[PDB]
Amino acid sequence: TDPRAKWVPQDNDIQACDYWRHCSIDGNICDCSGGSLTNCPPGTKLATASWVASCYNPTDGQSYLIAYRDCCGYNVSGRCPCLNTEGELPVYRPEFANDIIWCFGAEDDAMTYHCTISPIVGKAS
Amino acid sequence: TDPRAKWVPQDNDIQACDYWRHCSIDGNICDCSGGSLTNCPPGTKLATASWVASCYNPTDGQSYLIAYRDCCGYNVSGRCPCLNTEGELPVYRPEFANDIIWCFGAEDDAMTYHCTISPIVGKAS
Amino acid sequence: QETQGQAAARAAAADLAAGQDDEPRILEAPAPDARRVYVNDPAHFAAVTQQFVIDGEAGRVIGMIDGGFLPNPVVADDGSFIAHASTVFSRIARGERTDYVEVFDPVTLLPTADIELPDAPRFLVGTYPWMTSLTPDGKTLLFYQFSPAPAVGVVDLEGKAFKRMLDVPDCYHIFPTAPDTFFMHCRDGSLAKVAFGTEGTPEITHTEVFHPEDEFLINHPAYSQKAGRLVWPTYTGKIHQIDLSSGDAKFLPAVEALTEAERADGWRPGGWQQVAYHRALDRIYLLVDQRDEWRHKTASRFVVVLDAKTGERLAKFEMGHEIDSINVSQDEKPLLYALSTGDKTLYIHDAESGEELRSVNQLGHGPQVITTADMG
Amino acid sequence: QETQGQAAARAAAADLAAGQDDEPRILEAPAPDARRVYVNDPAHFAAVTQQFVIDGEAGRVIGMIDGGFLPNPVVADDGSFIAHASTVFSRIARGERTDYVEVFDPVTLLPTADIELPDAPRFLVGTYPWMTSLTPDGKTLLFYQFSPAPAVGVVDLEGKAFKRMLDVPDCYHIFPTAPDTFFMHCRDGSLAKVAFGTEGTPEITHTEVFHPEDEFLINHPAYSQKAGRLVWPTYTGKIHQIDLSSGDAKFLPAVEALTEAERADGWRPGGWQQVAYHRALDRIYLLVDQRDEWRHKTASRFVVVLDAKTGERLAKFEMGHEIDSINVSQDEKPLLYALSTGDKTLYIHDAESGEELRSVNQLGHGPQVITTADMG
Amino acid sequence: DDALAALGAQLFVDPALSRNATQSCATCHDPARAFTDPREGKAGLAVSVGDDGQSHGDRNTPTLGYAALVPAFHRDANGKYKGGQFWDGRADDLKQQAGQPMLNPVEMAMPDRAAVAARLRDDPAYRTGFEALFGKGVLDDPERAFDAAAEALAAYQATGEFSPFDSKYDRVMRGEEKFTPLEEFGYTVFITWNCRLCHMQRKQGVAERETFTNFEYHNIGLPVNETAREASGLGADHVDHGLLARPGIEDPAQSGRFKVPSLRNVAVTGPYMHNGVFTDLRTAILFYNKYTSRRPEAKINPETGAPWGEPEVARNLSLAELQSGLMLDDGRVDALVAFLETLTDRRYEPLLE
Amino acid sequence: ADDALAALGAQLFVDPALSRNATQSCATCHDPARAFTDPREGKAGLAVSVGDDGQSHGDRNTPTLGYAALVPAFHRDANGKYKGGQFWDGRADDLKQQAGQPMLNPVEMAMPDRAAVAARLRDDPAYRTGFEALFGKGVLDDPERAFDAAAEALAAYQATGEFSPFDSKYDRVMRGEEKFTPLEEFGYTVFITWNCRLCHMQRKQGVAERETFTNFEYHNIGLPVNETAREASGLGADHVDHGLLARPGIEDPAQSGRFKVPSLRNVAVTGPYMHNGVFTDLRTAILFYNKYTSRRPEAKINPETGAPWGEPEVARNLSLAELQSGLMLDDGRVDALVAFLETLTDRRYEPLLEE
Ligand code: HEC
Ligand code: HEC
Ligand code: HEC
Ligand code: HEC
Ligand SMILES: [Ca+2]
Ligand SMILES: [Ca+2]
Q: Would you list which residues of chain B are within 8 Å, Cβ to Cβ, of chain C?
A: 3-7, 26-27, 73-76, 78, 81, 83-94, 99-101, 103-104, 108-114
Identify whether residues E169 and E318 lie together within a single domain.
yes
Instruction: Assess contact for B45 and D26: CB atoms under 8 A.
Output: yes
| Helix extents (H) in chain F | 2-13, 26-29, 95-104, 114-122, 125-135, 143-158, 169-174, 182-193, 227-233, 282-288, 320-323, 331-342
CA neighbor of C300 nearest in space, from C317, C278, C281: C317
Length in residues, chain C: 376
Provide the resolution (angstroms). Answer: 2.0
Identify whether residues E232 and E296 lie together within a single domain.
yes
Identify whether residues F182 and F157 lie together within a single domain.
no
Asked whether the CA dihedral D55, D60, D63, D64 is positive or negative, the reply is positive
CA neighbor of A31 nearest in space, from A96, A120, A124, A117: A117
Taking CB atoms and an 8 Å cutoff, what residues of chain B touch D16? 60, 120
- Which residues contact residue D186 at a Cβ distance below 8 angstroms, ignoring those fewer than 6 apart? A92, D169, D170, D171, D172, D192, D206
Residue F255's alpha-carbon distances to C27, C296, F74, F80, in angstroms, are: 26, 66, 14, 11
CATH number at residue E343: 1.10.760.10
Bridge partners of D73?
D84
- Angstrom distance (rounded) from CA A25 to CA A3: 15
Phi, psi at E133, each rounded to 5° = -95, -30
CATH number at residue B59: 2.60.30.10
Q: Do D68 and C92 touch (CB under 8 A)?
A: yes
Q: Would you list which residues of chain A are within 8 Å, Cβ to Cβ, of chain C?
A: 11-16, 19, 31-46, 59-60, 69, 71, 74-75, 77-80, 117, 119-120
Task: Count the domains in chain F.
Answer: 2
Helix H or strand E segment including B64: strand B63-72
> How far apart, in Å, do the first and last CA atoms of chain B sit?
31
DSSP secondary structure, D87-98, as one string: EEEEETTEEEEE
Instruction: Assess contact for D338 and D285: CB atoms under 8 A.
Output: no
Cα angle vertex E230, ends E229, E231, to 5°? 90
Instruction: Assess contact for A51 and A68: CB atoms under 8 A.
Output: yes
Taking CA–CA distances from E290, the nearest residue in chain C reads C148
CA neighbor of E210 nearest in space, from D19, B58, B66, B38: D19
Q: Is the CB of F24 within 6 Å of ligand 3?
A: yes
Bridge partners of D268?
D289
- Angstrom distance (rounded) from CA A34 to CA C62: 4
Identify whether residues E308 and E186 lie together within a single domain.
yes
- Angstrom distance (rounded) from CA E1 to CA D5: 50
Q: How far is E206 from chain D (nearest CA, A)?
A: 8
- Angstrom distance (rounded) from CA E168 to CA E170: 5
**How does E322-341 read in b/e, with b if 16+ C-beta sit within 10 Å?**
bebbbbbbeebbbbbbbbbb
DSSP secondary structure, A50-116, as one string: -EEEEEE-TTTS-EEEEEEEEEESS----SSEEE--TT---TTSGGG--SB---TT-GGG--SEEEE
Query: CA-CA-CA-CA torsion for D158, D160, D164, D165, nearest 10 degrees?
Result: 100
* Experimental technique for the deposited model: X-ray
| Residue at which a domain ends, from E164, E183, E214 | E164
Question: Please, is F231 exposed, middle or buried when counting C-beta atoms within 10 Å of its C-beta (0-12, 13-18, 19+)?
Answer: middle
Q: Is F199 annotated as a binding residue?
A: yes
Strands (E), C249-307: 250-251, 255-256, 267-269, 275-278, 283-290, 300-307
Length in residues, chain B: 125
Bridge partners of D327?
D337
Asked whether the CA dihedral D64, D70, D71, D72 is positive or negative, the reply is positive
Quick check: helix, strand or coil at residue C352? coil
Bridge partners of D191?
D185
Name which residue sits closest to atom 35 of ligand 3, judged by CA. F99
Instruction: Assess contact for D142 and D150: CB atoms under 8 A.
Output: no
Question: Please, is D108 exposed, middle or buried when counting C-beta atoms within 10 Å of its C-beta (0-12, 13-18, 19+)?
Answer: middle
Assign domain D1-376 one CATH number from 3.40.50.300, 3.20.20.70, 2.130.10.10, 3.30.70.1060: 2.130.10.10
Q: Do chains A and C touch (3 or more CB pairs under 8 A)?
A: yes
Boundaries of every domain in chain C: 1-376
Q: Is the CB of F155 within 6 Å of ligand 3?
A: no
Q: Do E203 and D22 touch (CB under 8 A)?
A: yes
| Residue at which a domain ends, from F107, F138, F165 | F165
Query: CA-CA-CA-CA torsion for B37, B43, B49, B52, nearest 10 degrees?
Result: -20
Enzyme catalytic residues of B: 51, 70
Q: How far is F102 from chain A (nearest CA, A)?
A: 37
Identify whether residues F14 and F141 lie together within a single domain.
yes
Q: Do B119 and D28 touch (CB under 8 A)?
A: no
Identify whether residues F278 and F134 lie together within a single domain.
no
Identify whether residues F160 and F170 lie together within a single domain.
no
Q: How many CA atoms lie within 13 A of D92 on its CB side?
A: 25
Closest CB from C24, C29, C66 relative to A74? C66
Question: What pairing do the DSSP bridges indicate for beta strands D151-156 and D161-167?
Answer: antiparallel
Asked whether the CA dihedral B73, B76, B80, B84 is positive or negative, the reply is positive
Tell me the residue range of the domain where E112 lies: 1-164
* Amino acid identity at F2: D
Instruction: Assess contact for C144 and C131: CB atoms under 8 A.
Output: yes
- Angstrom distance (rounded) from CA E8 to CA E18: 16
CA neighbor of D369 nearest in space, from D71, D86, D87: D71
Asked whether the CA dihedral F244, F248, F250, F256 is positive or negative, the reply is positive
D69 in catalytic set? yes
CA of F59 to the centre of ligand 6 (A): 13
Q: What's the Rg (C-alpha) of chain C?
A: 21
Question: Please, is E311 exposed, middle or buried when counting C-beta atoms within 10 Å of its C-beta (0-12, 13-18, 19+)?
Answer: middle
Quick check: helix, strand or coil at residue F288? helix
Helix H or strand E segment including D243: strand D238-243
Q: Is E29 annotated as a binding residue?
A: yes
- Angstrom distance (rounded) from CA E171 to CA C275: 44
Instruction: Assess contact for A98 and A42: CB atoms under 8 A.
Output: no
CA of D332 to the centre of ligand 3 (A): 81
C31 CB near a chain F CB, below 8 Å? no
CA neighbor of C43 nearest in space, from F210, E250, B113: B113
Instruction: Assess contact for D371 and D38: CB atoms under 8 A.
Output: yes
Q: How far is A87 from chain D (nearest CA, A)?
A: 6
Bridge partners of D185?
D172, D191
- Angstrom distance (rounded) from CA E85 to CA E62: 10
Q: What's the Rg (C-alpha) of chain D?
A: 21
Identify whether residues E159 and E174 lie together within a single domain.
no
Q: Do F325 and A49 touch (CB under 8 A)?
A: yes
Tell me the residue range of the domain where A62 lies: 1-125
Identify whether residues E63 and E132 lie together within a single domain.
yes
Instruction: Assess contact for C269 and C300: CB atoms under 8 A.
Output: yes
- Angstrom distance (rounded) from CA E333 to CA E302: 13
Task: Count the domains in chain B.
Answer: 1
- Which residues contact residue C263 at a Cβ distance below 8 angstroms, ignoring those fewer than 6 apart? C236, C237
Identify whether residues F138 and F228 lie together within a single domain.
no
Question: Please, is E208 exposed, middle or buried when counting C-beta atoms within 10 Å of its C-beta (0-12, 13-18, 19+)?
Answer: exposed
Angle between helices E330-341 and E281-288 in degrees, nearest 10: 130
Identify whether residues F113 and F170 lie together within a single domain.
no
CA of F223 to the centre of ligand 4 (A): 11
- Angstrom distance (rounded) from CA C100 to CA C115: 5
Distance of CA F134 to the CA centre of its chain: 29
DSSP F13: H
Residue A95's alpha-carbon distances to A68, D303, F187, in angstroms, are: 10, 31, 11
Catalytic pick from A20, A31, A51, A102? A51
Phi, psi at A31, each rounded to 5° = -55, -20
F180 CB near a chain A CB, below 8 Å? yes
DSSP secondary structure, C65-131, as one string: EEE-SS-EEEE-TTSS-EEEEEEEEEETTEEEEEEEEEEE-TTT--EEEEEEETT-----BS--GGG
Identify whether residues E190 and E52 lie together within a single domain.
no
The two counts, helices (H) then strands (E), for chain C are 2, 30
Residue C283's alpha-carbon distances to C255, C257, C288, in angstroms, are: 12, 12, 16
DSSP secondary structure, E158-186, as one string: TSTTT----SHHHHHHTTSS---HHHHHH
Name which residue sits closest to atom 34 of ligand 2, judged by CA. E195
* Amino acid identity at C283: R
- Angstrom distance (rounded) from CA C171 to CA C206: 11
Catalytic pick from D45, D52, D69, D216? D69
Length in residues, chain D: 376
Residue D239's alpha-carbon distances to D306, D307, E43, in angstroms, are: 11, 12, 90
Region label for E325, one of left (φ > 0), alpha (ψ between -120 and 50) or beta (otherwise):
left
Q: Is F219 annotated as a binding residue?
A: no
Question: Where do breaks (C to N over 2.5 Å) occur in chain E, by preceding residue number?
Answer: none
- Which residues contact residue A22 at a Cβ distance below 8 angstroms, ignoring those fewer than 6 apart? A14, A29, A55, A82, A84, A118
